[PDB]
Design a binder for this molecule. Structure first.
Ligand code: YQM
Ligand code: K
Ligand code: K
Ligand code: K
Ligand code: K
Ligand code: K
Ligand code: K
Ligand code: K
Ligand code: K
Ligand code: K
Ligand code: K
Ligand code: K
Ligand code: K
Ligand code: MG
Ligand code: MG
Ligand code: MG
Ligand code: MG
Ligand code: MG
Ligand code: MG
Ligand code: MG
Ligand code: MG
Ligand code: MG
Ligand code: MG
Ligand code: MG
Ligand code: MG
Ligand code: MG
Ligand code: MG
Ligand code: MG
Ligand code: MG
Ligand code: MG
Ligand code: MG
Ligand code: MG
Ligand code: MG
Ligand code: MG
Ligand code: MG
Ligand code: MG
Ligand code: MG
Ligand code: MG
Ligand code: MG
Ligand code: MG
Ligand code: MG
Ligand code: MG
Ligand code: MG
Ligand code: MG
Ligand code: MG
Lengths: 127, 222, 98, 150, 115, 206, 100, 84
RNA sequence: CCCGCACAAGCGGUGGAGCAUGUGGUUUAAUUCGAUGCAACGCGAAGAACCUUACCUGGUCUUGACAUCCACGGAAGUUUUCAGAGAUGAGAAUGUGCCUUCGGGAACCGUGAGACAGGUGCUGCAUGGCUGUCGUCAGCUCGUGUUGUGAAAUGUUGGGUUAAGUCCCGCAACGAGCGCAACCCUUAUCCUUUGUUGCCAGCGGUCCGGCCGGGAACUCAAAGGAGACUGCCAGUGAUAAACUGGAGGAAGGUGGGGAUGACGUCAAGUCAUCAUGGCCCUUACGACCAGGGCUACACACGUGCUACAAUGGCGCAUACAAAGAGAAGCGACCUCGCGAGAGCAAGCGGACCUCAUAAAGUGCGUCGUAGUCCGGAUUGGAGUCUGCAACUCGACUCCAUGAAGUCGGAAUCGCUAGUAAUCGUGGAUCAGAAUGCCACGGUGAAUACGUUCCCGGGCC
């Protein structure tokens, strides 16, 4: 019936519901084109289905909260990947090879005392 | 004597490497090799077995120090058949002179030994249990012979005074009689009962080791 | 409905205090919704640690305020009696709302 | 570094990792969308002026800007000798793309897309400051051809 | 073209062209054009001489150019004559609005006068 | 270098807090100030009673003070008369009804504060610092400390140049967060000024 | 801090409590849109005549242990130095060294 | 500047000294430390000796001064140049 | 022989401009004191109008502003008047309580002694405590043994190896301690439990709003677990430690980040947080007050912010965060104002309410390379708010003004990845007063051949 995957990226979390269909993609009650202006974001979302060739064989219902454009697109990609592996477990190795199965664990590094940012140190002068 | 030279007690080391102090126990320099004088050997070998009996019939302890890749096996047998102690791998410098400390390594081995049999190992992790497993084996190679030896020895049967210069020097400091198979290429000065002998050939070593096995065993019999 | 909000600086205390509150209520003919773990407030403090200068030498401290919500639904009279005679650990702030 | 120890995602429109790298070199301040728009605008202009494809016309510009050899200040007692070193193929592209972008930024046309299309078309015909820097790098490598083997 | 005794740029949009007048910024410019019923983005060249006359009438409601220059000059003269703190700052060519003079104040002081 | 406070670093790991009340911001500073005044009063009043630790709870509209002491009988007094004096004064300071409990320190030689206070008492009576330090270390190790460190710093023996002297026996693994390191300090107010004492007592891991 | 400086703060807190209601009443009149210009004027003049130390803005938060007028934290009522000392002895409930 | 709804600030002690001075026609300078007081129309013609930190600077009040603070006419810092 | 953003390779800066800010200097009545190569200079100060405040000028007090003790009057208070800049002085109303053995008390006030109080006065080179620093560098030691007449050595060197005195092996050392690592926090995956204030997959609605029944799935919340060990595999290696790949896995070799700072070094910093030996002042070096100063300005240096534009400015439309704060507080909605704001006045001690709108982005339009539709300094006028009070010396708004600046010489700084760069957001301090500090997400690079050189360091 309905295959689910949670995906996360930076501070984004995506809830991806996949059912058999005809290439419908809804994201927060909006089309993929409406939700993401960026073609990179759109590419990121479509990557898993283009890889497995199920672009027009599956309807995706997606909700996504938190982070930004790229975070959300990456969260969605991770969610689709996980939904696809629930749908068909044979796809794992192909999706694994593409790098889509990994939860990208790169987060904003905290600001530290005595630094301007996480690593940016204040300007030194000899005297 | 005919069996001493069958065993190979007769043929000492090359003449290049000789210690001049061992010249009285060198009959020939035949074919670029010093040959140990057996007429000096046999009288001196029996007075060693004499004193080993007198020590072992006082019911003291012999330490069979022979830490070369050839006699490590036989010192770990000529002290088991004998019911005595051995060092068959690296003599830890300070085994006797620093016995107070080296006895704490004995105690740690015995803790680790119980842990291996009981399987407190099994309760600990791979990293932890296998580290204390390897620590057991390292302690056993060094101090396996001298574990049941809560006390400084009363004698120190040595093979090759050259190799066990540390052990002999320790025994000389503490006042323990050494019974060394002193070779032609080796210093006899520190040794108490010099046995002039080839100290390398397994067959030469086994012969000595069966005699010192008996004399101590016969000490214990009476 | 009795809404019980528990606050504490130690989560082990607050979990003990909720365990007792759900015990007393479920004994006494009440339907207990919870304990619901509400967001922990992490209140952070950064102090200079030198008495003088050394601005980059600092300690960062945190008070975590743990928060649990227990709702006692269709509460019995036995329920309300038993809840008031309970004695939770000192260290747990207990706010009751009806 | 003292101990020798990312993968660029291919660009959406054309599927090139080389053009993805080109966008990254053009990009400032993490503004990749802005950089993407410039490059795709420039490549449309470049594809329309040649009749060659966007990536094909890009490759022809890179062909003419890529250095084969460069100098490295390799200090070996007394003075420091500029030693001609073969540029490895990834660095050839890296330098070419960096020089094109550097050249395009120096130009006087209105938008960067136009500045970039002009520099790429100029690169293809061997008449820009990017091509000039490749020629400058080559002649300094030619002038120090004595100090190979170093 | 000629409003308030200055030549306004003919090529520029009216909203920008009128800011050539001393005393007309972006806000007043928008108000003048709103009051004249002229769109902001009409080039001054494209306006009829009827429309330029309406702009002259709207600009005349504000104090601009020499009239504004005399008001500002008189306002500073008043302070300097009073000998109030602000007056003294005007006289000495130092910041008048509390700013530091240990460093900076270069807009008021001009270029660095080396010792 | 400078070292983290051994108690502070272990506060949620192996080491409890000495104040275990909850408060919102409204009451928080007031409670800290009343706790300070209670600890100040009791520390002064029980200076000869070998008080290690004063734990303060605030259950509801009250204060509960546990006094950890090596000499509980002297604190409690004759049929609880002296502890009743403390309770009334604590109740005035806190401005709420007070309960005082007395916990016994069975082993004062293993209590870092009592060891520190013992050394500083001896230094104020002009005992040789090295003698006081060595006995403190000896006594703790005899009574089953897995290790102890004692540091004494200042004008030792009324020297003009201040110096730090320390002695350690056993393990004192200060980077091990699960190490039960009892740490405390004391000041000897001598004729030549302040000698600071620091005591670390390791009582095993976890 | 000096004993006198601590005493000044006590005086300021006491006066601010004493006159709080009067000051609030006068400032209500001064603020009020519907008040007379006479009543607002008189209220302006009256608020001046009250002790300056009755204004709460005259109070400086000081460390309640030392009187330090800098480095204060309101949560604790202490300077940064005394917060740290208390924190490390386990005397500030819940407070521990923070990492994240 | 002070919000118009609150009116101009003057210290009551100065306000009463000015009222007395005007009502008596007293032309002796009014000594004040109220630098923060607004100059009112009734002060016109009075000399007000305004404290500058160390001296009372005589300010002969003119109509142009009305609405300024008294302290504006009594500079507190002495400066005659660096190389003076 | 090794290592580290040390260099190289890169990317962005500083140095030039304006402004903010600290310092030096100079000035001043005072510009309070401290910090001074790295390791002082947006440092103590997490916020100087008054206060703070330590300084100056002047006005004042002398057992005192702040304690304890005694004696002698008085409840405490609350009102209010005059004089005075105020400190304070002189009054005038109005209380007459609380324990009570009915003798007293002791609440809180004078007032008189003098024992003392008081001191941000001096010495950080008399000190404690706390801190910086080499440096999170891999070191530093000890017992016993042994070597040397001895200072000392050995261990700790050596062969491999590691981020690491990390580990293995050898070895007159054998062990041990403090460091390294681990245990702690956080982050990345999953599971269990709980399900409101959070959630909405499937239902039933529906005003289209998780809005309402409901649901407990999912996001998430936060407790408890699981997970990563070079465990597995292959090769290499001394039948070693380890190393190089591979698999699986959310994660791989210390996964990322933090906390954690050995013995010691610099008589390093701090007697002005505090404490403290000694010294010094005591009708003054103490104390109170108003006003001024700490904000001065020929100038020099450090740290920043904003720019110089078109990868941009402006206008319009329109997406997507995280973290946090809040009761003398956060303050919605509505109304009024061009606006800062104001007036009403909900809600919220908070997953509920409020701050609060992310901005960069995207789309459309415009400007067309100009000292400009760049920049936003400076100055005039008019305001708002906080606050007894914004003259010296606040922040903010509106109108007007529209400076320098066209990418910065020698030199020099940061950074190796969710980093740099760039974009907003929040917090502490705080009545008000950030371009600083601390924190939070968004977008998101380049480059690293290498170790010759520069700097700091480790081992022989
Ligand atoms: C930063 N700087 C200026 C120096 C610097 O660069 C370094 C450094 N290590 O780099 C430093 O050491 C310093 O900072 C520092 O701390 C100094 C002192 O303490 C100090 C001191 O206190 C006394 N004291 C007395 O003679 C007291 N008296 C006894 C009789 C009466 C007077 C004498 C004395 F010469 C010194 C040396 C200074 C030097 C100073
Ligand atoms: K204009
Ligand atoms: K200024
Ligand atoms: K010190
Ligand atoms: K030794
Ligand atoms: K002192
Ligand atoms: K001032
Ligand atoms: K700045
Ligand atoms: K700068
Ligand atoms: K402009
Ligand atoms: K001001
Ligand atoms: K620059
Ligand atoms: K504020
Ligand atoms: Mg960031
Ligand atoms: Mg800084
Ligand atoms: Mg909150
Ligand atoms: Mg200013
Ligand atoms: Mg004091
Ligand atoms: Mg204040
Ligand atoms: Mg104005
Ligand atoms: Mg470089
Ligand atoms: Mg500059
Ligand atoms: Mg200064
Ligand atoms: Mg100093
Ligand atoms: Mg000083
Ligand atoms: Mg120095
Ligand atoms: Mg002041
Ligand atoms: Mg008066
Ligand atoms: Mg003093
Ligand atoms: Mg010092
Ligand atoms: Mg060493
Ligand atoms: Mg180690
Ligand atoms: Mg967990
Ligand atoms: Mg792998
Ligand atoms: Mg560690
Ligand atoms: Mg010094
Ligand atoms: Mg003052
Ligand atoms: Mg200053
Ligand atoms: Mg502009
Ligand atoms: Mg705030
Ligand atoms: Mg805000
Ligand atoms: Mg836009
Ligand atoms: Mg690095
Ligand atoms: Mg920023
Ligand atoms: Mg090393």
């Amino acid at each position: 019936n309905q295959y689910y995957g949670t995906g996360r990226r930076k501070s984004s979390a995506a809830r991806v519901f996949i059912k058999p269909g005809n290439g419908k993609i809804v994201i927060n009650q909006r089309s993929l084109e409406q939700y993401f202006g960026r073609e990179t974001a759109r590419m990121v979302v479509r990557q898993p289905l283009e890889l497995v060739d199920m672009v027009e064989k599956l309807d995706l219902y997606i909700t996504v909260k938190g982070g930004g454009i790229s975070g959300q697109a990456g969260a969605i990609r991770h969610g689709i990947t996980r939904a696809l592996m629930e749908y068909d477990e044979s796809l794992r190795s192909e999706l694994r090879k593409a790098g889509f199965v990994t939860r990208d664990a790169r987060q904003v590094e905290r600001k530290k005392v005595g630094l301007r940012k996480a690593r940016r140190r204040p300007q030194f002068s000899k005297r | 004597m005919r069996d001493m030279l069958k065993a190979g007690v007769h043929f000492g080391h090359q003449t290049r490497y000789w210690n001049p102090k061992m010249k009285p126990f060198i009959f020939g320099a035949r074919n670029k090799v010093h040959i140990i004088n057996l007429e000096k050997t046999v009288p001196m070998f029996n007075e060693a077995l004499a004193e080993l009996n007198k020590i072992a019939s006082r019911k003291g302890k012999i330490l069979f120090v022979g830490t070369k890749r050839a006699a490590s096996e036989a010192v770990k047998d000529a002290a088991l058949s004998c019911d005595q102690f051995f060092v068959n791998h690296r003599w830890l410098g300070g085994m006797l002179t620093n016995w107070k400390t080296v006895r704490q390594s004995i105690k740690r081995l015995k803790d680790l030994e119980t842990q291996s049999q009981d399987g407190t190992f099994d309760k600990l992790t791979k990293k932890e249990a296998l580290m204390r497993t390897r620590e057991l084996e390292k302690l056993e190679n060094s101090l396996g012979g001298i574990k049941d030896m809560g006390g400084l020895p009363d004698a120190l049967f040595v093979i090759d005074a050259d190799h066990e210069h540390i052990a002999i020097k320790e025994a000389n400091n503490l006042g323990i009689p050494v019974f060394a198979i002193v070779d032609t290429n080796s210093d006899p000065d520190g040794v108490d009962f010099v046995i002039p002998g080839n100290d390398d050939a397994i067959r030469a070593v086994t012969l000595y080791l069966g005699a010192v096995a008996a004399t101590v065993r016969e000490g214990r019999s009476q | 409905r009795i809404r019980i909000r528990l606050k504490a600086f130690d989560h082990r205390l607050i979990d003990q205090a909720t365990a007792e509150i759900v015990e007393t209520a479920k004994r006494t003919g009440a339907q207990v919704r919870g304990p619901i773990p509400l967001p922990t407030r992490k209140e952070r403090f950064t102090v200079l640690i030198s008495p003088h200068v050394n601005k980059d030498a600092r300690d960062q401290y945190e008070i975590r305020t743990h928060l649990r919500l227990v709702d006692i639904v269709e509460p019995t009279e036995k329920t309300v009696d038993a809840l008031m005679r309970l004695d939770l650990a000192a260290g747990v702030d207990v706010q009751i709302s009806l | 570094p003292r101990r020798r120890v990312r993968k660029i995602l291919p660009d959406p429109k054309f599927g090139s990792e080389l053009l993805a790298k080109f966008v990254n070199i053009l990009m400032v301040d993490g503004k990749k969308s802005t950089a993407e728009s410039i490059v795709y605008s420039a490549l449309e202009t470049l594809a329309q002026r040649s009749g060659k494809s966007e990536l094909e016309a890009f490759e022809v510009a890179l062909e003419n800007v890529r250095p084969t050899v460069e100098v490295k200040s390799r200090r070996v007692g007394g003075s420091t000798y500029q030693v001609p070193v073969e540029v490895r193929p990834v660095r050839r592209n890296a330098l070419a793309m960096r020089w094109i972008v550097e050249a395009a930024r120096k130009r006087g046309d209105k938008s960067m897309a136009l500045r970039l299309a002009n520099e790429l078309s100029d690169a293809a015909e061997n008449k820009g400051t990017a091509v000039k820097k490749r020629e400058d790098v080559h002649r300094m490598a030619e002038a120090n051809k004595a100090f190979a083997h170093y | 073209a000629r409003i308030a005794g200055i030549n306004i740029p003919d090529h520029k949009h009216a909203v920008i062209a009128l800011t050539s007048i001393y005393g007309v910024g972006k806000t007043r410019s928008k108000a003048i054009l709103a009051a004249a019923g002229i769109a902001e983005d009409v080039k001054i060249s494209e306006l009829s001489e009827g429309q330029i006359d309406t702009l002259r009438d709207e600009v005349a409601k504000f104090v601009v150019e020499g009239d504004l220059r005399r008001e500002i000059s008189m306002s500073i003269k008043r302070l300097m004559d009073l000998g109030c703190y602000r007056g003294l700052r005007h006289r000495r060519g130092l910041p008048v609005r509390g700013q530091r003079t240990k460093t900076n104040a270069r807009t008021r002081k001009g270029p660095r006068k080396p010792i | 270098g400078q070292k983290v406070h051994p108690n502070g670093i272990r506060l949620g790991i192996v080491k409890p807090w000495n104040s275990t009340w909850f408060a919102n911001t409204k009451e928080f500073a007031d409670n800290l100030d009343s706790d300070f005044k209670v600890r100040q009063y009791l520390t002064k009043e029980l200076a000869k009673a070998s008080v290690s630790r004063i734990v303060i709870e605030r259950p509801a509209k009250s204060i509960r003070v546990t006094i950890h002491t090596a000499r509980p009988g002297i604190v409690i007094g004759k049929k609880g008369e002296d502890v009743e004096k403390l309770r009334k004064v604590v109740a005035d300071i806190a401005g709420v009804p007070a309960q005082i409990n007395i916990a016994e320190v069975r082993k004062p030689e293993l209590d870092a504060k009592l060891v520190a206070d013992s050394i500083t008492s001896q230094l104020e009576r002009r005992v040789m610092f090295r003698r006081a330090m060595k006995r403190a270390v000896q006594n703790a190790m005899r009574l089953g400390a897995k290790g102890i460190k004692v540091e004494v710093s200042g004008r030792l023996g009324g020297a003009e140049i201040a110096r730090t002297e320390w002695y350690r026996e056993g393990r004192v693994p200060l980077h091990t967060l699960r190490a039960d390191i009892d740490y405390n300090t004391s000041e000897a107010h001598t004729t030549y000024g302040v000698i600071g004492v620091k005591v670390w007592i390791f009582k095993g891991e976890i | 801090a000096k004993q006198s400086m601590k005493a000044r703060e006590v005086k300021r807190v006491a006066l601010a409590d004493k006159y709080f209601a009067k000051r609030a009443e006068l400032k209500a009149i001064i603020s009020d849109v519907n008040a007379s210009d006479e009543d607002r004027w008189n209220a302006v003049l009256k608020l001046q005549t009250l002790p300056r130390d009755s204004s709460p803005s005259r109070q400086r938060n000081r460390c309640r242990q030392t009187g330090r007028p800098h480095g204060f934290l309101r949560k604790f009522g202490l300077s940064r130095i005394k917060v740290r000392e208390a924190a490390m002895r386990g005397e500030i409930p819940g407070l521990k060294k923070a990492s994240w | 500047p002070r919000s118009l709804k609150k009116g101009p600030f003057i210290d009551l002690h100065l306000l009463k000294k000015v009222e007395k001075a005007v009502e008596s026609g007293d032309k002796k300078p009014l000594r004040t430390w109220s630098r923060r007081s607004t100059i009112f129309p009734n002060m016109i013609g009075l000399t007000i000796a305004v404290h500058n930190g160390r001296q009372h600077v005589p300010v002969f009040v003119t109509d142009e001064m009305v609405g300024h603070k008294l302290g504006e006419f009594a500079p507190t810092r002495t400066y005659r140049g660096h190389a003076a």
